[PDB]
Design a protein around this ligand. Structure first.
Ligand SMILES: NC(=O)N[C@H]1NC(=O)NC1=O
Ligand SMILES: NC(=O)N[C@H]1NC(=O)NC1=O
Lengths: 142, 142
């Protein structure tokens, strides 16, 4: 539909496989995206896509709500735990931000820090997919 | 016990964390290895460790049985499907070889080819751990 998918998912492979898809509605596009993401792209592609995002607490818009409500204290712990999380899991903390505060997200990060690396990899994959779905609606609603 | 663990697991992190472990029996060492492998090292470390191995059908000893029973035909499909598997999953096909034939392993590879990349990542992690356990016994039995 438009290889501007590298923006709608930092995964080159996902963008590629989507670029060559027989155009469909805004609904079928969602379903075809999830199947490719969850069953076709490999772990390496998931990692590329995660890296494309700014950490939670930095800027590069899903974070508008969090910034319209942030605090130096939240931005502080955040900048610190992001470092801790990257060291432990190998990729940055991924979460679909939106109506979320930096405080709630800092808490979700601390919480998730205690997961096994393999499980954090599944949760991030899911959070990434939600972000992608969110951005696809923005392309089809327009 | 001896940072020669990079040989007993291509993971630098796993080797590191093990190098600084209060010496224990051949049994406690196994259990401490599994916990570190499954709950401490990240996906990136799993990937480093997989890469350290020769593909099934190539040489760099767990493969002695398979070579004492191989065939040009098995070595052929193998060399081909290994390429296909790497393309799809992002890492080579990992399996504890031993009393296994290239034929049985070629079949396990074709079978596993139909798994979701995330699941192949778990199976490889487990196969890798079995290989590691196998090699640790060889260090403590000596
Ligand atoms: N850190 C992190 O997950 N950032 C991503 N999440 C989101 O909603 N937008 C992003 O860029
Ligand atoms: N391909 C692959 O898993 N090779 C590994 N397995 C094993 O038993 N020894 C290896 O080096």
């Amino acid at each position: 539909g438009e290889d501007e998918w590298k923006v709608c998912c930092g995964s080159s492979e996902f963008a590629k496989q989507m670029s060559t898809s027989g155009p469909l509605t805004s609904q079928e596009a969602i379903y075809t995206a999830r199947d490719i993401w969850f069953n076709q792209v490999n772990v390496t592609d998931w990692l590329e896509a995660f890296s494309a995002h700014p950490q939670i607490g930095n800027t590069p818009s899903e974070q508008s709500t969090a910034f319209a409500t942030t605090s130096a204290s939240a931005l502080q712990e955040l900048a610190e735990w992001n470092v801790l999380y990257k060291k432990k899991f190998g990729f940055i903390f991924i979460i679909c931000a939106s109506g979320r505060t930096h405080a709630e997200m800092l808490h979700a990060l601390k919480e998730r820090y205690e997961n096994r690396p393999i499980v954090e990899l599944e949760i991030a994959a899911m959070e990434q997919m939600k972000i992608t779905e969110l951005r696809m609606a923005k392309l089809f609603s327009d």
